[PDB]
Amino acid sequence: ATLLRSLALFKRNKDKPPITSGSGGAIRGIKHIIIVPIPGDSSITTRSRLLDRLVRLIGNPDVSGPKLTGALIGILSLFVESPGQLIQRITDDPDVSIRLLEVVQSDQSQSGLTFAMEDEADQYFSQSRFGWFENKEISDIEVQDPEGFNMILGTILAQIWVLLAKAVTAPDTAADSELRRWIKYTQQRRVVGEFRLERKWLDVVRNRIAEDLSLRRFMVALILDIKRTPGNKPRIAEMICDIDTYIVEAGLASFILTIKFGIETMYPALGLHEFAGELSTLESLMNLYQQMGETAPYMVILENSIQNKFSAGSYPLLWSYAMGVGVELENSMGGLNFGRSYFDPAYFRLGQEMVRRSAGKVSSTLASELGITAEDARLVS
Amino acid sequence: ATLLRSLALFKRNKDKPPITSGSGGAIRGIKHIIIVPIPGDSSITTRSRLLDRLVRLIGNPDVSGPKLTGALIGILSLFVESPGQLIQRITDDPDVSIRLLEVVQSDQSQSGLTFAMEDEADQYFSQSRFGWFENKEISDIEVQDPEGFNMILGTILAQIWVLLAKAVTAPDTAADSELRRWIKYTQQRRVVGEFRLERKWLDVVRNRIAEDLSLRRFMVALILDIKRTPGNKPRIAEMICDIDTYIVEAGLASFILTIKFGIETMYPALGLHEFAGELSTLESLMNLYQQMGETAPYMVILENSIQNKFSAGSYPLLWSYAMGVGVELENSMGGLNFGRSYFDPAYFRLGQEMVRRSAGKVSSTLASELGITAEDARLVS
Amino acid sequence: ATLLRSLALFKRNKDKPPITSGSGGAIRGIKHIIIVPIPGDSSITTRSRLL
RNA sequence: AAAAAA
RNA sequence: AAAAAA
RNA sequence: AAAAAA
């Protein structure tokens, strides 16, 4: 009686994150500078030419690590006026000091851009291995009207933000899926259809986003800044806050799914005592998921320290049950790979059979809600 | 017991929109100016000649993007006195700065309008490819009496506001349907019957409204301003607030419909455990639909970020069930296309059969409301 | 059980008219004058001849 | 994203 | 770590 | 003191 109250407080502080008082500057990463080219002026011509040079900058093999990181941050912030104030607002990272150099257009330079310095600029910005748009009839995207820039910018960013959904979880599998989101934005007339980048260009970005952590911290934390914008967003932000729904819980699909099929379906095989403790583990992780705040759905994009805590190994039987339930109830979850060292297939087939036995077997915990008679429950069977 | 209370709070903040505190001017779109010609004076003669020049301005192939946007905003606000104060009241858009130039009539100009500047004006305003009224006996609509203008203005606006209903959802299918609303307003004597524009004129507007977002934000947000007008509206506003009923939830017909046929019919195949969680997903989206306020029904006209949340993919089984129910119960919903990658036809035919089995099978949850006997329920069968 | 209470509030605000706070003189129609002849005096003879 | 709605 | 989601 | 846990 007093054991169960002591047990409930024992389990919730075991999952509870340690309260981060802080070490007063003790643990600080050594910072490497990242060269972020930001347009010098508000005019469209500069934004357009910098977007032209940064897109082909990324494709070449020659570019190093943080040169590719700053070129990506260079175009993930071209949609705002004053991109320099956007970067310093977002970078709460300890490992990275962003030094950001303004880029103004020029007449004398080979690339057409100088730094606000004409040969150091082209040394920054500069045939089968070069990545580009997949229809090679387009050589230069430099445009003049700003809505022609704003459509050619979202066509580039909607092919980079969709990579973040499936960069840490399924890089190999991913190329099949981001073409479906490309059909979504082409048919919505959000993006321009002929400017689809090569898979070779995107494999440079996708193996970059998967590799470094400092780019995934920037990309998550600006999405969390896009989401906070009060009014109607600018039309690139209202697209970046459209792609994010594919990134929200991108890798918690052994926990989000278990809750969806184990807990919520409420088959009578939850009153097993074998599950009676792994519900109490899982009711704490549901309470923990808003204790983590709004950075909770991105805890495996960001590689947070407590995505080990939402792992299915702490509830391996109730996970396998909700694997068994969700194979029949989804034609999509048949494509889900779930192979782990704690799989327990005995439970999985017990959870498969609960779906099959109760096929036309209208419940008792939702029939009193409606008033289902024995006359009515036979008609469903 | 305490699991289900933790589960209910876990599901409602998962759907809950992030509270928009704001980034303090961090994310601001680069603004392109849009040339909006507004009549210089209150007199009818100017309004009439500007409406004449803006209607033929739209038809020609030569007009660019935002020149077509400002010409449309130029005529979507001719019905008010002081159209300049209407535009600044509505444009809460970050992507668009409306600069609006007054237009006064002239004797010396070729078009007949100057800017309050005689050659820059006709350079703004100016044979098979030109779009016009479908009966070519009418060349000029310039009229003098103001009720002859107010009827020739509503005849133009009731052919543009009906495009917004089916511009983002069914542009190809749409031309069959807006002729039915044209019969509605002709038989109500709301519009003048001989001034029907070409489909070639309307295809310029419909492929414009579908393309840009900044025109759909203006058209929605003034409808929300028409709706707020306290007394009896002016007779164009009482027509724009008549067309809007065709635009309210124009594209949520996988959610509005599911609720109408899945939830509300209350067949005994809702006590399935396969649906018992997708009711709780769908009871949050019903609570979310007024948490979004009065801009909720337009969330797919405006391409809001959380029309992915009312998508049927989060409840794909209970959607397919309400697809199965609604095919028999409507001779209209047989024309509904519902083809998605999450369709699950097993459920669809389970929802088709619940309509067919309970044909003459008066319920138990509404018979106690009336007092239906076994004598009376046999008479319905 | 709590679905039906959420359903009943969902259907009544869908039909509910939007509360007309007002746009503060933003949407005003252009007014055309209408000539209304009204009798000058209370006497019956004028009312009769105007009718 | 899709139907119908004086 | 893996699926699907206008 | 013993296992497993992206």
Side-chain angles (χ1 to χ4, degrees):
Chain A
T2 190
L3 180 66
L4 297 178
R5 189 172 65 246
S6 179
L7 179 63
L9 274 73
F10 174 75
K11 285 190 68 70
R12 67 184 179 182
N13 69 347
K14 180 175 286 295
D15 287 329
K16 180 175 70 178
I19 50 99
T20 58
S21 64
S23 66
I27 300 164
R28 66 176 75 90
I30 43 96
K31 292 184 181 290
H32 59 284
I33 50 95
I34 288 179
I35 315 294
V36 177
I38 64 180
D41 53 1
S42 61
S43 301
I44 175 60
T45 180
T46 300
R47 298 294 186 86
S48 62
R49 186 179 294 170
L50 180 64
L51 181 65
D52 187 12
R53 297 296 185 271
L54 285 172
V55 162
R56 73 177 70 253
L57 174 53
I58 308 179
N60 66 185
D62 300 1
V63 153
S64 177
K67 186 175 181 179
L68 181 61
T69 303
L72 279 170
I73 298 173
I75 54 174
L76 289 172
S77 64
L78 286 178
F79 64 97
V80 294
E81 180 68 26
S82 299
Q85 293 181 356
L86 184 63
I87 306 299
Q88 278 74 244
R89 178 67 182 269
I90 299 302
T91 178
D92 52 357
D93 304 336
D95 201 7
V96 161
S97 67
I98 294 295
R99 59 92 64 88
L100 76 176
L101 43 86
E102 290 86 4
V103 171
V104 292
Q105 62 178 355
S106 177
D107 53 353
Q108 64 181 357
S109 179
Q110 176 178 3
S111 66
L113 294 173
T114 55
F115 291 166
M117 295 296 107
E118 66 271 15
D119 53 356
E120 185 176 359
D122 196 12
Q123 199 273 331
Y124 183 71
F125 292 112
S126 180
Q127 296 295 321
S128 298
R129 60 176 61 89
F130 290 102
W132 188 243
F133 299 99
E134 67 184 2
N135 46 2
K136 269 75 69 173
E137 290 82 6
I138 307 300
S139 176
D140 56 355
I141 61 182
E142 300 179 1
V143 297
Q144 280 71 238
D145 50 354
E147 79 278 7
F149 173 70
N150 202 3
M151 288 296 289
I152 202 66
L153 183 63
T155 308
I156 298 298
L157 269 66
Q159 303 173 6
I160 298 167
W161 288 104
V162 296
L163 301 179
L164 187 65
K166 297 173 81 70
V168 296
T169 63
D172 60 9
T173 313
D176 186 74
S177 176
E178 288 106 12
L179 196 146
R180 284 195 296 273
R181 285 87 181 86
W182 179 252
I183 297 301
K184 186 176 87 72
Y185 294 115
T186 303
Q187 298 297 318
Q188 284 185 354
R189 299 180 71 182
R190 296 279 191 86
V191 298
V192 183
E194 59 262 15
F195 294 92
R196 174 68 175 169
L197 288 163
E198 281 286 330
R199 290 183 293 112
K200 189 173 180 66
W201 192 87
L202 295 169
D203 285 332
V204 176
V205 181
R206 187 185 297 114
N207 291 116
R208 182 60 185 165
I209 295 174
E211 180 70 30
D212 61 357
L213 184 55
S214 65
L215 183 58
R216 294 202 299 270
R217 286 175 180 169
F218 174 73
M219 290 176 72
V220 166
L222 91 94
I223 289 173
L224 274 70
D225 200 3
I226 297 298
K227 288 183 185 292
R228 291 182 180 96
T229 299
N232 44 4
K233 303 175 183 65
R235 55 99 59 216
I236 307 301
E238 204 169 6
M239 189 190 295
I240 295 169
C241 199
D242 194 87
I243 297 170
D244 60 353
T245 60
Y246 302 101
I247 308 167
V248 168
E249 301 104 6
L252 294 174
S254 66
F255 167 72
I256 295 302
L257 297 178
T258 296
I259 301 299
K260 179 177 169 64
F261 296 118
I263 309 297
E264 294 182 3
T265 59
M266 286 176 286
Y267 286 138
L270 288 176
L272 270 70
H273 304 87
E274 293 87 4
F275 293 160
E278 298 174 355
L279 304 182
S280 179
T281 298
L282 198 62
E283 75 181 2
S284 69
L285 304 182
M286 287 188 281
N287 290 322
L288 201 156
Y289 187 80
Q290 68 261 15
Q291 181 179 357
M292 292 178 68
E294 71 272 15
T295 184
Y298 300 94
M299 75 177 80
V300 67
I301 305 297
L302 295 172
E303 297 298 330
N304 199 359
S305 302
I306 59 174
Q307 58 92 29
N308 308 106
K309 191 171 263 76
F310 291 87
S311 179
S314 65
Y315 49 97
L317 304 179
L318 198 272
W319 173 66
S320 304
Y321 178 78
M323 289 301 109
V325 174
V327 170
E328 297 91 6
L329 298 186
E330 295 292 323
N331 292 114
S332 67
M333 192 174 162
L336 179 65
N337 202 165
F338 47 101
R340 282 89 186 272
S341 298
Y342 51 86
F343 173 64
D344 186 75
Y347 282 92
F348 176 81
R349 70 188 71 188
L350 186 148
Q352 281 187 347
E353 80 179 12
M354 292 300 288
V355 179
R356 298 195 182 107
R357 299 296 182 89
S358 63
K361 197 173 262 77
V362 174
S363 64
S364 299
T365 185
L366 205 149
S368 64
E369 309 302 3
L370 274 69
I372 305 301
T373 65
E375 179 68 27
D376 294 332
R378 289 186 293 112
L379 191 145
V380 181
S381 297
Chain B
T2 190
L3 180 66
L4 297 178
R5 189 172 65 246
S6 179
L7 179 63
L9 274 73
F10 174 75
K11 285 190 68 70
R12 67 184 179 182
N13 69 347
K14 180 175 286 295
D15 287 329
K16 180 175 70 178
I19 50 99
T20 58
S21 64
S23 66
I27 300 164
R28 66 176 75 90
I30 43 96
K31 292 184 181 290
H32 59 284
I33 50 95
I34 288 179
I35 315 294
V36 177
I38 64 180
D41 53 1
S42 61
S43 301
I44 175 60
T45 180
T46 300
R47 298 294 186 86
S48 62
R49 186 179 294 170
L50 180 64
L51 181 65
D52 187 12
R53 297 296 185 271
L54 285 172
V55 162
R56 73 177 70 253
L57 174 53
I58 308 179
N60 66 185
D62 300 1
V63 153
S64 177
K67 186 175 181 179
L68 181 61
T69 303
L72 279 170
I73 298 173
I75 54 174
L76 289 172
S77 64
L78 286 178
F79 64 97
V80 294
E81 180 68 26
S82 299
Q85 293 181 356
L86 184 63
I87 306 299
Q88 278 74 244
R89 178 67 182 269
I90 299 302
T91 178
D92 52 357
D93 304 336
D95 201 7
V96 161
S97 67
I98 294 295
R99 59 92 64 88
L100 76 176
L101 43 86
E102 290 86 4
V103 171
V104 292
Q105 62 178 355
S106 177
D107 53 353
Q108 64 181 357
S109 179
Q110 176 178 3
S111 66
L113 294 173
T114 55
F115 291 166
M117 295 296 107
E118 66 271 15
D119 53 356
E120 185 176 359
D122 196 12
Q123 199 273 331
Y124 183 71
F125 292 112
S126 180
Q127 296 295 321
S128 298
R129 60 176 61 89
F130 290 102
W132 188 243
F133 299 99
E134 67 184 2
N135 46 2
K136 269 75 69 173
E137 290 82 6
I138 307 300
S139 176
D140 56 355
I141 61 182
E142 300 179 1
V143 297
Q144 280 71 238
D145 50 354
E147 79 278 7
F149 173 70
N150 202 3
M151 288 296 289
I152 202 66
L153 183 63
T155 308
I156 298 298
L157 269 66
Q159 303 173 6
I160 298 167
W161 288 104
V162 296
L163 301 179
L164 187 65
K166 297 173 81 70
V168 296
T169 63
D172 60 9
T173 313
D176 186 74
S177 176
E178 288 106 12
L179 196 146
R180 284 195 296 273
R181 285 87 181 86
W182 179 252
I183 297 301
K184 186 176 87 72
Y185 294 115
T186 303
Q187 298 297 318
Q188 284 185 354
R189 299 180 71 182
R190 296 279 191 86
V191 298
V192 183
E194 59 262 15
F195 294 92
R196 174 68 175 169
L197 288 163
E198 281 286 330
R199 290 183 293 112
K200 189 173 180 66
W201 192 87
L202 295 169
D203 285 332
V204 176
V205 181
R206 187 185 297 114
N207 291 116
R208 182 60 185 165
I209 295 174
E211 180 70 30
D212 61 357
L213 184 55
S214 65
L215 183 58
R216 294 202 299 270
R217 286 175 180 169
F218 174 73
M219 290 176 72
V220 166
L222 91 94
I223 289 173
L224 274 70
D225 200 3
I226 297 298
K227 288 183 185 292
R228 291 182 180 96
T229 299
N232 44 4
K233 303 175 183 65
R235 55 99 59 216
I236 307 301
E238 204 169 6
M239 189 190 295
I240 295 169
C241 199
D242 194 87
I243 297 170
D244 60 353
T245 60
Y246 302 101
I247 308 167
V248 168
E249 301 104 6
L252 294 174
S254 66
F255 167 72
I256 295 302
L257 297 178
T258 296
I259 301 299
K260 179 177 169 64
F261 296 118
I263 309 297
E264 294 182 3
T265 59
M266 286 176 286
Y267 286 138
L270 288 176
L272 270 70
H273 304 87
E274 293 87 4
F275 293 160
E278 298 174 355
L279 304 182
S280 179
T281 298
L282 198 62
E283 75 181 2
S284 69
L285 304 182
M286 287 188 281
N287 290 322
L288 201 156
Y289 187 80
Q290 68 261 15
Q291 181 179 357
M292 292 178 68
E294 71 272 15
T295 184
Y298 300 94
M299 75 177 80
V300 67
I301 305 297
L302 295 172
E303 297 298 330
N304 199 359
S305 302
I306 59 174
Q307 58 92 29
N308 308 106
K309 191 171 263 76
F310 291 87
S311 179
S314 65
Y315 49 97
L317 304 179
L318 198 272
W319 173 66
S320 304
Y321 178 78
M323 289 301 109
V325 174
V327 170
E328 297 91 6
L329 298 186
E330 295 292 323
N331 292 114
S332 67
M333 192 174 162
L336 179 65
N337 202 165
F338 47 101
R340 282 89 186 272
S341 298
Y342 51 86
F343 173 64
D344 186 75
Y347 282 92
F348 176 81
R349 70 188 71 188
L350 186 148
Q352 281 187 347
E353 80 179 12
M354 292 300 288
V355 179
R356 298 195 182 107
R357 299 296 182 89
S358 63
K361 197 173 262 77
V362 174
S363 64
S364 299
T365 185
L366 205 149
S368 64
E369 309 302 3
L370 274 69
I372 305 301
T373 65
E375 179 68 27
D376 294 332
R378 289 186 293 112
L379 191 145
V380 181
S381 297
Chain C
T2 190
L3 180 66
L4 297 178
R5 189 172 65 246
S6 179
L7 179 63
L9 274 73
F10 174 75
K11 285 190 68 70
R12 67 184 179 182
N13 69 347
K14 180 175 286 295
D15 287 329
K16 180 175 70 178
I19 50 99
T20 58
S21 64
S23 66
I27 300 164
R28 66 176 75 90
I30 43 96
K31 292 184 181 290
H32 59 284
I33 50 95
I34 288 179
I35 315 294
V36 177
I38 64 180
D41 53 1
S42 61
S43 301
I44 175 60
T45 180
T46 300
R47 298 294 186 86
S48 62
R49 186 178 294 170
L50 180 64
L51 181 65

